[PDB]
Design a protein around this nucleic acid. Structure first.
Lengths: 49, 174, 170, 60
DNA sequence: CTCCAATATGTGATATAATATA
DNA sequence: ATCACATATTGGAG
DNA sequence: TCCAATATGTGATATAATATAGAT
DNA sequence: ATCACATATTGGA
């Protein structure tokens, strides 16, 4: 059930690792920018897990 | 040129002191040409085209028509934009819906830098720092702007699920 | 068809064509201008004589300046309204179409007669060609092929009015 | 029943919303069904069936 | 029961930056 | 963090 | 020097009813 | 992911 959150985290951290010549703090903020309360529930339902 | 020796040098990206001075000369000429172009009561679209072409021409005239400065400027903007492709692939995938591509951003940024940034260049100042800052900030602005309409690209693929989104969306309410 | 050029610190073109053929990286406009001689250069009769003959017979259809786009009723587009924000549901094909348009506009707003930097114009043409190729490929792979495709679903078969479904009993 | 955006018959959610008593769901004539129907060499009658029931609006 | 003029209010378009490197 | 243009609302008279 | 084998990569393609829903 | 089909190298002969 928690796998979509892991996928989202992995996308964010791949972004930050591959970031070049930009503010690291900014990308670290983008990691947790669109994390929303209903994200896990919506992803659980829609992915038909 | 003295400061460029320490850092890793890429021949296409490096900006000589002479090129910085060429850009400054073009900046002075652009500033003195702006009021004349603004007073022209012709249509604004043809006026923007004329401003772009005229500023390109002042840079070329200071460049002896070599067009090397414009090539290096395009290369700078191209590098700054394409560096974010691998890292920020998600926002580029989303921006595909808005008909915005990396090369499109490069061309638009080229027009903006020649028209709305080069005139603002300060005397005896480094062009590369100002350009880096403005391009990176414009990329941040682009990735972080709230567009009026959220976009849902219907994936017409059935690799895993039995029915794709376009299929059901067609049959239900249309 | 793709255009690529490198520059020196001073800005002179420095590629020198050391490892690339003279015909490569010329551009799509140079390709159209030099299409006949290049065709004679690279065609192998033994394996592609029939294809080369087909190209000769249809030389007019090889290069086109206008791209068709099919009806919007086939391209589903819904303007749904949401609380946090409005939403637009479209099939991916639309994107590609729109992309093409944008490109041509940015190519046409600049005066074609005035000489401009090739790096600003030729890669745009190459990307336009890539997008058009993807449009054709997606039309075949989505709208016109398979069980989902209009060919198998509705050209041979069809949903039939005046139909019923019943259980059987002795 | 309700016609699709392409002018061809298609299912509706009316039975789910209890707006209709029976399903009113269209049957599909499969490719194998077309092959079996081709036993009768009157392809004109089969085409008339498919056109009047689905493909052509004027014939319907 | 229209028509006038003007006011305050809404909406789209634009604008901000000055430590460089496949 | 403005600003030029579009719009519903008040003021006013006929 | 060549070549056939191995390996990589490309490409078509897939049942049957069915619960929905990315700064000021 | 199974089947086909096509190249690219490479160890082998």
């Amino acid at each position: 059930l928690l796998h979509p959150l892991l996928i989202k985290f992995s996308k964010g951290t791949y972004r930050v690792l591959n970031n070049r010549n930009s503010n690291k703090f900014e990308k670290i903020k983008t990691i947790f920018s669109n994390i929303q309360e209903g994200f896990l529930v919506k992803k659980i339902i829609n992915n038909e897990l | 040129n003295q400061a460029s020796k320490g850092k890793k040098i890429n021949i296409e990206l490096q900006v000589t002191d002479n090129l910085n001075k060429i850009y400054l000369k073009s900046s002075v000429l652009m500033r003195i040409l702006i009021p004349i172009l603004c007073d022209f009561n012709c249509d604004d679209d043809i006026n923007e085209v004329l401003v772009y072409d005229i500023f390109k021409e002042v840079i070329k005239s200071f460049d002896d028509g070599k067009k090397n400065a414009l090539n290096k400027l395009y290369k700078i903007i191209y590098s700054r934009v394409f560096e974010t492709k691998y890292s920020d692939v998600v926002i580029w995938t989303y921006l595909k819906n808005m008909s915005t591509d990396l090369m499109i951003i490069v061309k638009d940024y080229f027009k903006v830098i020649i028209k709305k940034i080069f005139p603002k260049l300060k005397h005896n100042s480094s062009v590369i720092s100002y350009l880096d800052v403005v391009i990176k900030q414009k990329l941040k602005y682009l990735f972080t702007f709230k567009y009026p309409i959220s976009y849902k690209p219907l994936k017409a693929e059935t690799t895993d699920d039995e029915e794709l989104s376009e299929q059901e969306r067609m049959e239900i309410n249309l | 068809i793709n255009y690529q050029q490198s520059i020196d610190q001073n800005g002179e073109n420095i590629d020198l064509t050391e490892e690339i053929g003279e015909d490569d990286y010329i551009g799509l406009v140079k390709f159209k201008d030099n299409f006949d001689d290049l065709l004679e250069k690279y065609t192998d009769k033994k394996k592609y004589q029939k294809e080369y003959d087909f190209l000769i017979e249809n030389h007019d259809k090889i290069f086109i300046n206008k791209l068709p786009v099919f009806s919007h009723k086939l391209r589903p587009a819904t303007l749904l309204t949401g609380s946090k924000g409005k939403v637009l549901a479209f099939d991916e094909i639309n994107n590609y179409y729109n992309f093409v348009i944008e490109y041509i506009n940015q190519i046409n707003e600049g005066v074609v007669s005035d000489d401009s930097i090739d790096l600003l114009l030729l890669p745009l043409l190459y990307n336009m060609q890539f997008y058009a190729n993807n449009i054709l490929t997606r039309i075949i792979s989505e709208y016109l092929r398979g069980k989902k495709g209009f060919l198998r679903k509705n050209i041979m078969g069809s949903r039939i009015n005046f139909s019923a479904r019943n259980v059987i009993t002795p | 029943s309700f016609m699709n955006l392409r002018g061809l018959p298609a299912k509706s959610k009316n039975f789910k919303e209890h707006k209709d008593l029976y399903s009113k769901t269209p049957v599909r004539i499969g490719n194998m069904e077309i092959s079996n129907l081709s036993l009768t060499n009157e392809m004109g009658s089969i085409m008339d069936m498919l056109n009047s029931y689905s493909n052509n609006e004027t014939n319907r």
